[PDB]
Amino acid sequence: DILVVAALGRPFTLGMLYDARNDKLIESSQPSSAFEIIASDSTDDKSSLMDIEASLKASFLGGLVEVGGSAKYLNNQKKFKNQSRVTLQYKATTSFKQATHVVIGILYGANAFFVFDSNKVDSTNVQEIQGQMEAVIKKIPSVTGEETDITNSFSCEFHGDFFLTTNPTTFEDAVKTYQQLPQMMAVPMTVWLVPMSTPILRKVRNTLEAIVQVQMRCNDALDDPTVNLFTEVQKKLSDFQKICDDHMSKLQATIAKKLFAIDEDESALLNLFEENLQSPFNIESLNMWMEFEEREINVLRSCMDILTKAKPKVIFNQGVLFKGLYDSKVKHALCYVFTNVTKNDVFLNVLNEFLDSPPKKLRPSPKDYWYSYDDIPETMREKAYLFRNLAKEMNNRCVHFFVTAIHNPKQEGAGIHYYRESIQIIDEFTKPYMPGVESIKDRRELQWYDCELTLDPETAHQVLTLSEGNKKAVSTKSPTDHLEKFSHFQQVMCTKGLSGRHYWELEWSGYVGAGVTYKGIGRKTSTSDSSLGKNEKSWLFEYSYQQIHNSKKTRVTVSSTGFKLLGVYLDWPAGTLSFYMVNKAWVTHLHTFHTKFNEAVYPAFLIGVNGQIKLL
Amino acid sequence: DLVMPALGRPFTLGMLYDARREKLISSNAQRSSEFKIVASDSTESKSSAMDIEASLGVSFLGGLVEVGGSAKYLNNTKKYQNQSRVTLKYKATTVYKQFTHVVTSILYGANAFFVSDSDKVDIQGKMEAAIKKIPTISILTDEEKSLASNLSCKFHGDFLLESLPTTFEDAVKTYQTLPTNSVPMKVWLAPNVSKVRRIHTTLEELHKLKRRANEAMDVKLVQRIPLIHDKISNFQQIFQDYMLTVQKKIAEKLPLVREQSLQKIIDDRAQSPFSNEKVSKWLDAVEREIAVLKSCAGMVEGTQAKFVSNQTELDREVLVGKVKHAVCFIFTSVERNDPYLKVLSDYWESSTEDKWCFSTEVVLKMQQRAQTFCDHVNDFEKSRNVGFFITALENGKFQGASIYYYKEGSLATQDFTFPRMPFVQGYKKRSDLLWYACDLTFDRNTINNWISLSNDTFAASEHGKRQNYPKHPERFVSFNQVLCNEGLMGKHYWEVEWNGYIDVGIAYISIPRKIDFASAFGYNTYSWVLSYNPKIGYIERHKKREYNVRAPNPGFKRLGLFLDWRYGSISFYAVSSDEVHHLHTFKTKFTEPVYPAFSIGPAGNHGTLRLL
């Protein structure tokens, strides 16, 4: 009995051998033109366009059938699940000419596939963009505005029976190529040849299609930004795609071998499928694992999203991290460490164990993964918010914030690590636990709250000369004046108004008076209302060493009478303003003010019998 | 002699042929071109257009014959019953060549098909009236032109073209080009009518269900709900595989008969779970599911509620920092693995009575819940930390649908009705107040000349060097006061990081802006505030009256404020991280929309105020 088989780009000549187990052993005029657009890519859909018979399709799925140009479209798989794919097919037939079978007659033609793929999108917007694509692709067989935007949203991938110098990758390129196609008109398309089961077909397609579908799901995950940060996550997904590739290749080998048999009762092949449903390689289980890994991605992502807002240095490479941590400029280092992310997975091992030795489970268990429930991720999210808070109150030159992953079974979920210089001080930081201000000897302690200050030129007296970006100010008037200018007293304020824990240190030389004030201080008086310390709004510490507040001066004992570097530490909510002598790594306490700050205080100075201050 | 239409398949003189419609492998010129209009797309009309007989007809149903060019028109079937289809047949007979079966004479000629389809929205006769003119015109009413514009065209012909027609215009200029090698049109061959209709009846019945399934699939909601989509999708694939089994049975038995073996195929369908009554019944149930889900989902349309495809997506949405309260409306009764589609699959490899969507109680209670949900959506429209979503996740515990609730990224309940709250003085958990937490912004039209603003979320009073603000009647002329833009008509919560000499409160827009008793907060019948004067302490002001308020932690940086406009409540709390310490609450009758109002103090005494 005579049969008709689709050439599928396979080189066919007028008299040739063909085995009906679809291996191929190596002039009438029939003009026809047509085109078809499909918004699908299942094997059933690709088969429907290429008019592939159930038998040939099954042998193609089994991998027995190789393909030629244009038919290479069959081997063009959609990368992502959540991606719009609209294929345009131009199909033309030109002429007709005239193992188990011999070729008697063959129909000649040549077709082309314009495979248009959108970028990975959300699940909800795939239908909208698919319709949009169909619409503008429907316009292509014509020999735009917002529509133009869409044409630049998707790429093109061509599979043709025509020899092309340059292949289209653009919508513009596709129309340019499409316009040229009718002139380029030839390879055998349909083959006549003479001799010399519906449950298996469904089971072959359904089994293999299912795996393909899971591997697109895996790909969506791999394209995730959070996956690219967490290498152990990246590893597991790569391992799962390999497991599936190896599983599908195994099935295909048996299918191709047992398909040929059609001498053997098909019962054996049926059993492989029956066995597959009984195995942990059931699609419910493979998808269930995907779902678990998807959950891990969301808990790590939600954590990262919290942290990122603190603008930390996210170093996942231990080499770069510890060289970054142990830098000269890093006085205090605070790391948010992920302590549970692991490359090892119980179910992935079960799957590899079934591939090599055809187990512990047939389903992945929520009991094998930390990220399954809510308590561990919830406390991970808590430490994240705390980390961000510390980051907000410690946004300075001394304290540095990092994010990394260091697996440790003794710590759960994550932890806030505190490194100072070369060592790890604590693996679960919460507070610096600052000592009593009159008791501070270690400079680092105060540097937890490093405070950069620049002088406000509008407040500075005309006598004062400000330079080096308003960090240095020397005590010869200036013509310029302001409504916020200190007209009588030689005083200057900073731009920042402080309400917490701030530590600034300066270089001073002569008669300088350092302190804080409310902006309520008068600018234009030769009265108590405008001099620092003579107010109930101002605190001062000047050298001739006195402490002024509420027009009350008291002496302060200083062993090193003339010192260059001065340190000032404000603890606004506690109500203390401390003065220190700074020398190298150590700090000498000089005087502390125990009061109540009724407003945000502005660091201010009194200079001039001439002085200079260089803010650091 | 046996004459049959030469379908796209090639024919040569003296070529061998079989009655299983497979083919084993003087001329007097004709030259004539005419047309025909096929107003029906029925398998019979396709056959009438192409002069297909009973033997070839039945053979095409078994799919034994290979078609080509124009003959592809046979394969081209209506997807939706709702669309209207008129086809223009072009025919060109030109050369007649003469000499189980052998071809003695073959008529040569090419013909084309112009399949015109209307939108999915009598439109049948109106279309044929327009199409009738194609061979009469050469590139016609404004009304006719508008109909022609909304028609789609498909070309099926024995021509290799330089361009293919997609447009009516395109079909006209193509049709003009058509008469300018050639294929066999009709062939002459030289060596059961009772069942033909029964087989044709069986396949048209099956194609009716196929078209029904496709219509069911074309809904927007179906595409938004993967559980119902994958259901229809699976049925589509199963039913497609079944239609192949049946055609292969016909294709296998047809050569043999060339009778009751054919009837066996028909009788098996009626006795199988693939019965017209069985399949129809199921499609009646999936259609009712789509109907009920549409009724519920339709309620939340046009609001900030979001559809999500699965748990992975719902997780992402609820797990966001900002979404402190997430109430999701979920369809619990749509099954992940349809038991009837299992029967169908299990049949291929070898009871809707009590169905949820057919329950007065289930559908009524579910519709009541869908409304409860909508009420929250509209109520919590301006609540920045409350998120609304919709999905379908099969849950045995609930029938029809339920409301899941996620508190700070973690599932609280799968059966939510309302957020339970204490009375305004009993608020201890910050989370509870975040149900009503909204975004506030300073009104640049009221901001006093000496108050400097940020993004319009941070106010600090200047000591000297006053700010230039445009002249508006709405503006404080001689007070360090500012109002927000948001007029509050119900339950609202807002936090503020305050310092120095300041007050936080509310005021009617009908408050004076230009230095009198009537324009200062708490010295109106129109203003209520909690003032902080570090010198004295804390107090509340209204209608020139001051009231001493005890603050547990004096000088606390963050202040929490909750207003219930419907009752006359306004409460003040000390915000300490995730905990609230109620300071003082008070009652007042609020006649008109209430605006957050602030003072940042006079003279050397200064305030600082940041909206959070």
From Swiss-Prot, chain A:
Intrachain disulfide bonds may be present in the heterodimer. Not glycosylated. Residues 433-616 form the B30.2/SPRY domain. Expressed by the venom gland. Residues 315-441 are annotated as: Thioredoxin (THX) domain. It is found in: Secreted. The keyword Cytoplasm does not apply. Residues 198-314 are annotated as: Structural FAT domain. It holds the Pfam family MACPF_SNTX. GO terms for cellular component: extracellular region. One of its GO terms (molecular function) is toxin activity. Keywords: Cytolysis, Disulfide bond, Hemolysis, Ion channel impairing toxin, Myotoxin, Neurotoxin, Potassium channel impairing toxin, Secreted, Toxin. One of its GO terms (biological process) is killing of cells of another organism. Residues 1-197 are annotated as: Structural MACPF/CDC pore-forming domain. PANTHER family: AIG1-TYPE G DOMAIN-CONTAINING PROTEIN, SI:CH211-281L24.3. The first domain (residues 2-265) is structurally homologous to the membrane attack complex-ferforin/cholesterol-dependent cytolysin (MACPF/CDC) pore-forming domain. It makes numerous contacts with the FAT domain and comprise essentially the core pore-forming machinery. The second domain is structurally homologous to the focal adhesion-targeting (FAT) domain (266-385). It makes numerous in cis contacts with the MACPF/CDC domain (first domain) and the thioredoxin (THX) domain (third domain) as well as extensive in trans interactions at the SNTX-alpha/beta interface. Heterodimer of alpha and beta subunits; non-covalently linked. This lethal (towards mammals) heterodimer induces hemolytic activities due to its ability to form pores in the cell membrane. The pore may be composed of 10 SNTX-alpha/beta heterodimers. The toxin elicits potent hypotension which is endothelium-dependent and appears to be mediated by the nitric oxide pathway and activation of potassium channels. In addition, it displays edema-inducing activities, increases vascular permeability. It also shows myotoxic activities and interferes irreversibly with neuromuscular function. Belongs to the SNTX/VTX toxin family. This is Stonustoxin subunit beta.
Curated annotation (Swiss-Prot), chain B:
Heterodimer of alpha and beta subunits; non-covalently linked. Belongs to the SNTX/VTX toxin family. SMART domains: PRY, SPRY. The first domain (residues 2-265) is structurally homologous to the membrane attack complex-ferforin/cholesterol-dependent cytolysin (MACPF/CDC) pore-forming domain. It makes numerous contacts with the FAT domain and comprise essentially the core pore-forming machinery. This is Stonustoxin subunit alpha. Residues 419-612 form the B30.2/SPRY domain. Expressed by the venom gland. One of its GO terms (biological process) is killing of cells of another organism. The keyword GTP-binding does not apply. It is found in: Secreted. One of its GO terms (cellular component) is extracellular region. SUPFAM superfamilies: Concanavalin A-like lectins/glucanases. PROSITE patterns: B302_SPRY. This lethal (towards mammals) heterodimer induces hemolytic activities due to its ability to form pores in the cell membrane. The pore may be composed of 10 SNTX-alpha/beta heterodimers. The toxin elicits potent hypotension which is endothelium-dependent and appears to be mediated by the nitric oxide pathway and activation of potassium channels. In addition, it displays edema-inducing activities, increases vascular permeability. It also shows myotoxic activities and interferes irreversibly with neuromuscular function. One of its GO terms (molecular function) is potassium channel regulator activity. Residues 193-307 are annotated as: Structural FAT domain. Intrachain disulfide bonds may be present in the heterodimer. Keywords: Cytolysis, Disulfide bond, Hemolysis, Hemostasis impairing toxin, Ion channel impairing toxin, Myotoxin, Neurotoxin, Platelet aggregation activating toxin, Potassium channel impairing toxin, Secreted, Toxin.
